[PDB]
Amino acid sequence: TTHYSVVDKDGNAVAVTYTLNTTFGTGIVAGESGILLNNQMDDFSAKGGDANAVGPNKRPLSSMSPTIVVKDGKTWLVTGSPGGSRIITTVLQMVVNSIDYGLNVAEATNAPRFHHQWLPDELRVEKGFSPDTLKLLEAKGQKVALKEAMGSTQSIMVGPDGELYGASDPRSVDDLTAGY
């Protein structure tokens, strides 16, 4: 899965998140088309409940969340990210970091992330949080679990004056945010 954002000189904005599901998907190319085929059928409930069950012509549920935040009536933050169910909390943190903590788009992007998806019952964290903070969380009853980096945000913040501010996730080597 991968996400990209775009903002033009007129102030139009687009956020796109698309995928093959897993990396390279099935790894199967369609004959001599040179086109890799997705393995999206795995995103259906194999056996959640019946809501996301495999059915003909049905679209499997996805966590992909291209998102746009508006401030003072104007497009202000354009973001999104890959990461399966972690997409929800990654995008959530981009929004909270920007609105509540007043972080610029790069600061918000480079900040460490945490995540809790109910089951497993564990507060998953990236490297970067204070040992003192983590101990407090455990004292609160949280089961802290240090794991792999989460997501790949590609975002653009728009100033009311038209100035554009962007940031590519450090978690993805070779990525890039550029403009003119």
Partner 1 sequence: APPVSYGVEEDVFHPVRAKQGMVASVDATATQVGVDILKEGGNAVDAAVAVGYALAVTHPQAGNLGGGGFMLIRSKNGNTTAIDFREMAPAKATRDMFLDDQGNPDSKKSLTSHLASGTPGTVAGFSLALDKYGTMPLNKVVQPAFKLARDGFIVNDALADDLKTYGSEVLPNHENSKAIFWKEGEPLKKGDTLVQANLAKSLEMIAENGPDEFYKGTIAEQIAQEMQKNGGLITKEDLAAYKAVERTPISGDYRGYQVYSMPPPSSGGIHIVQILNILENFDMKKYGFGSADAMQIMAEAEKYAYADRSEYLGDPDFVKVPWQALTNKAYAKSIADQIDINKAKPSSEIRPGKLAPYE
Catalytic site positions:
1
Q: Does 53 bind partner 1 (CB under 8 A)?
A: yes
Q: Is 21 annotated as a binding residue?
A: yes
**Min separation Cβ 150 and partner 1, Å:** 13
Q: Output 16 or 146, the one with its CB closest to partner 1.
A: 16
Q: Does 88 bind partner 1 (CB under 8 A)?
A: yes
DSSP annotation of 48: -
Q: Under rule CB under 8 A, which residues in 95-114 are in contact with partner 1?
A: 95-107, 109-112, 114
Task: List the one residue out of 159, 145, 146 whose CA is nearest residue 74.
Answer: 159
Radius of gyration of the chain (CA): 18
Q: Output 69 or 149, the one with its CB closest to partner 1.
A: 69
Task: List the one residue out of 152, 167, 72 whose CA is nearest residue 113.
Answer: 152
With CB under 8 A as the contact rule, the residue among 118, 127, 131, 148 that binds partner 1 is 118
DSSP string computed for 112-136: --EE--SSS--EEE-TTS-HHHHHH
Q: Is 89 annotated as a binding residue?
A: no
Interior angle at CA 66, CA 46 and CA 58, nearest 5: 30
**Min separation Cβ 24 and Sm ion, Å:** 13
Neighbours of 83 (CB within 10 A): 24
Q: Which residues pair with 25 in a beta bridge?
A: none
Q: Does 146 bind partner 1 (CB under 8 A)?
A: no
131 binds, among Sm ion, partner 1, none (CB under 5 to 8 A by kind): none
Q: Under rule CB under 8 A, which residues in 123-142 are in contact with partner 1?
A: 123, 129-130, 133, 136-137, 140-142
61 binds, among partner 1, Sm ion, none (CB under 5 to 8 A by kind): partner 1
Question: 151: burial class by Cβ within 10 Å (0-12, 13-18, 19+)?
Answer: buried
Binding-site annotation, residues: 19, 21, 40, 43, 62-63, 83-84
